[PDB]
Design a protein around this ligand. Structure first.
Ligand SMILES: NN[C@@H](c1nnnn1CCc1ccccc1)C1CCCCC1
Length: 330
């Protein structure tokens, strides 16, 4: 089997991407944030504290004839950005772009933190990291990809995120028309539960490539590109007037600037992030100070190849017995 679904930016800045997901019988379609940095599929629901719902579409398990409460199961997640959610668990039928999994753990939110409430466009998350990170207790549950794997034509999914435009998540096949050149594959460590790999270096604009190992994760659920402070300093030093602002929380730059590209290495191959992809607009409405899309990972504890980097490439998440990651230009 295969599946193919369009993913759409939630706003004009590509702050996140939402993908429609059918849950239950009859289908209830929710727009979920596909997150290769976490491993819980959770949804706003009829059980979510009413004051914490503000425009989201909710899953109502009592209206699904295939929903079954998973007895005694609870979940609770504290995300790296300080957000959180928790609740109970149903199993139900979940379909993504024509691909159907029966008996998928659907984690129903009873509580969500303010940042989720305040984003009316995201109805929940669909985790695509490794199932070892799933938070369901006392019986850990599998991700949608792990459940579908055996049925897929090939045990892979691909992320093709658009710049200020829709893109595609495919399951079970590689669309050879969706990229240019060849896909370069690179080794993955699952030791932290992430799609963790090692970039071979970087370049800033037209500058020379610096060969240096950068360990990080491929994370569709992170907006920006978080890299070591040395790398980030070298990038913003090429932007006149750019500075790191403690009050804003990262590098900012004059909105009048033309940003240089950023290149990262995948083995001997190179992925080029155009400068425009690094512009996340005014720090506040009407400001002429703009927020940078490349930020320091210092104090995160890990480098993150988030959407800024991933949307410059066609990315293969290969879930073979030994997982790997593939990157192609497009
Ligand atoms: N999508 N899973 C990330 C996440 N969890 N919560 N937010 N992010 C977005 C990333 C981020 C990093 C720093 C500041 C703000 C946001 C995890 C972050 C911590 C490492 C594991 C992945």
């Amino acid at each position: 089997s295969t599946g193919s679904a369009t993913t759409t930016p939630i706003d004009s800045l590509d702050d996140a991407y939402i993908t429609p997901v059918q849950i239950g019988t009859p289908a209830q379609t929710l727009n979920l944030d596909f997150d290769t940095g976490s491993s819980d599929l959770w949804v706003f629901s009829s059980e979510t504290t009413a004051s914490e719902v503000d425009g989201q579409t909710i899953y109502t398990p009592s209206k699904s004839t295939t929903a079954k409460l998973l007895s005694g199961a609870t979940w609770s997640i504290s995300y790296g950005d300080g957000s959180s959610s928790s609740g109970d668990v149903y199993t139900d039928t979940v379909s993504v772009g024509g691909l159907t999994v029966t008996g998928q753990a659907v984690e129903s939110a009873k509580k969500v933190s303010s940042s989720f409430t305040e984003d009316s466009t995201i109805d929940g998350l669909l985790g695509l990291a490794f199932s070892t990170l799933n938070t369901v207790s006392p019986t850990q549950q599998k991700t949608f990809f792990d459940n579908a794997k055996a049925s897929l034509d090939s045990p892979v999914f691909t992320a093709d995120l658009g710049y200020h435009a829709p893109g595609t998540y495919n399951f079970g096949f590689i669309d050879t028309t969706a990229y240019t050149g060849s896909i370069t594959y690179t080794a993955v460590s699952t030791k932290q539960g992430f799609w963790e790999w090692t970039s071979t270096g970087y370049a800033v604009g037209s500058g020379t490539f610096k060969s240096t190992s950068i360990d990080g994760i491929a994370d569709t659920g992170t907006t920006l590109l978080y890299l070591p402070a040395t790398v980030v300093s070298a990038y913003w030093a090429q932007v006149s007037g750019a500075k790191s602002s403690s009050s804003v929380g990262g590098y900012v730059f004059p909105c009048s600037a033309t940003l240089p590209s950023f290149t990262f290495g995948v083995g001997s191959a190179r992925i080029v992030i155009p400068g425009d992809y690094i512009d996340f607009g005014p720090i506040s409405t009407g400001s002429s100070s703009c927020f940078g899309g490349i930020q320091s990972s210092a104090g995160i504890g890990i480098n993150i190849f988030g959407d800024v980097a991933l949307k410059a490439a066609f990315v293969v998440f290969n879930g073979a017995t030994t997982p790997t990651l593939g990157f192609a230009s497009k």
